[PDB]
Write a protein that binds this ligand. Structure first.
Ligand code: MXF
Length: 244
């Protein structure tokens, strides 16, 4: 079959072609595999950006700050994108990366409860600072790609410290693709308020046989770069390895 050298070269070429620097961590059982064109990013800390939504939702639901069918009403003020100027549930806001909805959720949770829950979960450096509505966007909260793939592994297998119903609700919110009997659950992320800008795509693959293969793509986003580049490189890498 295909050599490890060829797989590594192919995935590295996906990041090279996009003219960026990035890594993608794959986890099978307890083993971590690092691929990409800048392997040292694996243990470097970056803001989680939208990937934090997964945990924001978990906390919000567990602590009764919202329900899965509650509709967060658009307040009528201009948003960064027209697509965000509407009423939506947590799940809809997850799919649209609707930051305003999640900022409202964070405000309901409150700084004190948020700091305690982020600590309880041991997410990244666990520090949210003093601003409850933007700590995952501009710091001080940071996390490495290894910690992100492990967070995905824990959520996929319901190991996080939340009722299993809560975990299942948030997981249902993350289905972004189906391919050849395989289901891909993930959350993209783009930290535009930091320099350099970081891009993320963290989730897992649920294969027909029921096995789950967690992953975390992390790269530098550059001016005039497409968010869908995080997805194409992720899908191409997963396919090259025979995961999907
Ligand atoms: C790039 C995504 C979504 O991805 C899409 O390209 N849009 C898609 C919906 N079809 C999204 N970024 C994001 C955040 C999450 O990090 C957080 C902010 C804050 C301000 C401005 C943009 N902010 C975006 O600006 O649209 S990020 O991957 O969540």
């Amino acid at each position: 079959h295909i050599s490890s050298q060829q797989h590594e070269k192919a995935i590295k070429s996906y990041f090279d072609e996009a003219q960026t620097q990035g890594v993608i961590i794959i986890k099978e059982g307890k083993n971590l595999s690092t691929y990409g064109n800048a392997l040292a990013r694996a243990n470097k800390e970056y803001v989680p950006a939208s990937t934090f939504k997964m945990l924001n939702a978990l906390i919000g639901l567990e602590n009764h700050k919202a329900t899965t069918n509650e509709i967060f009403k658009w307040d009528g003020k201009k948003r960064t994108y027209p697509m965000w100027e509407k009423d939506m549930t947590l799940g809809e806001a997850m799919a649209l990366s609707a930051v305003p909805v999640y900022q409202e959720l964070a405000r309901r949770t409150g700084l004190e409860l948020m700091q305690k829950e982020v600590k309880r979960v041991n997410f990244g450096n666990t520090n949210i600072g003093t601003q409850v509505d933007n700590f995952w966007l501009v710091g001080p909260l940071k996390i490495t790609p290894v910690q992100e793939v492990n967070f995905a592994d824990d959520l996929a297998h319901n190991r996080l410290p939340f009722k299993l119903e809560t975990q299942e609700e948030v997981k249902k919110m993350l289905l972004i693709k189906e391919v050849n009997g395989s289901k891909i659950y993930a959350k993209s992320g783009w930290g535009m308020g930091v320099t350099p800008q970081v891009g993320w795509l963290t989730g897992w693959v649920e294969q027909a046989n029921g096995k789950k293969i967690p992953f975390s793509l992390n790269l530098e986003m550059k001016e005039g770069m497409s968010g869908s580049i995080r997805n194409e490189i992720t899908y191409k890498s997963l396919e090259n390895l025979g995961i999907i």
